[PDB]
């Protein structure tokens, strides 16, 4: 991996709750940046007084003929670092970054049906995966979003059906309700990314309840309600140190 610098070249509001930024990056190995579902760590704050603060966002795409990546930010009413950074972020804003990180991709091997679950934070990862989709594999995709028509941005591919549910603010387990209700349960493979607690629920269902092999349930928690990314990191470090001990 590398530590680059990104400079914002474009800013869009594709949906009312999403800010789409494009930036050139000074990569010296663009071969790394072409894989699907790459994520970066943006140094959202770097005061000279104090340790730096980073946050993880998905590379929606990487254009190699101009070294431009794009990132979708889910707006959320929180005085968080990434939110404070996005409020004052103009074209030409330079921001530090570390990456890329390859992240989960569906298991196309053996030709099993793919079933995908996502909330607003994993819609960019979904777009990345769909733009390099293994033609011939079928899928059911369930999206949990605040935007009524979040699927419109994703491509139309033969045999990928994309289902979107609509959340209303300040209130449920929708993605799980979809997992409990699939047409069949045999010869399928799972990919998911959402809030930490809903993702754990999905993992528990496809493993401890439907006996799916562990490499056929690729599930991640992109964020956790009431816990900051920084706190998630300190937790992940302590689990790792405790995992290697046994
Ligand atoms: C691999 C990976 C890829 C990711 N890609 C994206 C992406 O492409 N786009 C994107 O918008 N996010 C993405 N995320 C999630 C993002 O990193 C977190 O949402 C992050 O916590 C937000 O930064 P912050 O400074 O707002 O939040 P923090 O300071 O971490 O959060 C503090 C508070 O905000 C809450 N919070 C954080 N995010 C949300 C949210 N989306 N909705 C509601 N409440 C929230 C937390 O629960 C916490 O209570 C990704 C995460 C991972 C692991």
From Swiss-Prot:
One of its GO terms (molecular function) is nucleotide binding. It holds the Pfam family FAD_binding_9. FAD binds at residues 55-56, 58, 72, 74, 76, 78, 80, 82, 224, 226, 229. Its EC number is 1.16.1.10. The keyword Magnesium does not apply. Residues 1-107 form the FAD-binding FR-type domain. It comes from the Bacteria. Its cofactor is FAD. InterPro entries: FAD-bd_9_SIP, FAD-bd_FR_type, FNR_nucleotide-bd, SIP_C, SIP_fam. It catalyses: 2 a Fe(II)-siderophore + NAD(+) + H(+) = 2 a Fe(III)-siderophore + NADH; 2 a Fe(II)-siderophore + NADP(+) + H(+) = 2 a Fe(III)-siderophore + NADPH. Keywords: FAD, Flavoprotein, NAD, NADP, Nucleotide-binding, Oxidoreductase. PROSITE patterns: FAD_FR. Monomer in solution. Ferric-siderophore reductase involved in iron removal from the siderophores after their transport into the cell. Interacts with the siderophores acinetobactin (Acb) and preacinetobactin (pre-Acb) and catalyzes the reduction of the ferric iron bound to the siderophores to ferrous iron, resulting in destabilization of the siderophore chelation complex and entrance of ferrous iron into the intracellular pool of bioavailable metals. Can use NADH and NADPH as electron donors in vitro, but the reduction rate is very slow, suggesting that NADH and NADPH are not the physiological partners of BauF. Belongs to the SIP oxidoreductase family. This is Ferric acinetobactin reductase. It comes from Acinetobacter baumannii. The gene is bauF.
């Amino acid at each position: 991996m590398e530590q680059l610098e990104m400079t914002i070249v474009s800013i869009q509001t594709p949906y009312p709750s999403i800010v789409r930024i494009q930036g050139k990056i000074n990569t010296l190995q663009p071969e790394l940046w072409q894989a699907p579902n790459l994520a970066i760590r943006l140094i959202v704050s770097n005061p000279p007084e104090g340790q730096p603060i980073s946050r993880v966002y998905t590379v929606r795409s990487f254009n190699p003929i101009n070294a431009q990546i794009e990132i979708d930010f889910v707006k959320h009413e929180d005085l968080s670092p990434a939110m404070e950074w996005l409020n004052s972020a103009q074209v030409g804003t330079k921001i530090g970054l570390i990456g890329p990180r390859p992240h989960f991709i569906p298991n196309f091997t053996a030709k099993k049906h793919v079933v995908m679950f996502a909330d607003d934070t994993a819609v960019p990862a979904l777009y990345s995966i769909l733009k390099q989709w293994e033609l011939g594999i079928s899928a059911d995709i369930f999206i949990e979003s605040f935007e009524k028509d979040i699927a419109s941005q994703l491509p139309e591919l033969e045999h990928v059906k994309i289902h979107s549910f609509h959340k209303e603010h300040h209130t449920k387990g929708l993605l799980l309700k979809a997992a409990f209700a699939l047409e069949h349960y045999e010869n399928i493979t799972i990919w998911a990314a959402c809030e930490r607690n809903e993702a754990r629920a999905l993992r528990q269902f496809f493993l401890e309840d439907q006996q799916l092999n562990k490499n056929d349930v690729r599930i991640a928690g992109y964020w956790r309600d009431g816990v900051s990314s920084s706190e998630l990191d300190k937790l992940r470090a302590q689990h790792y140190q405790e995992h290697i001990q046994q």
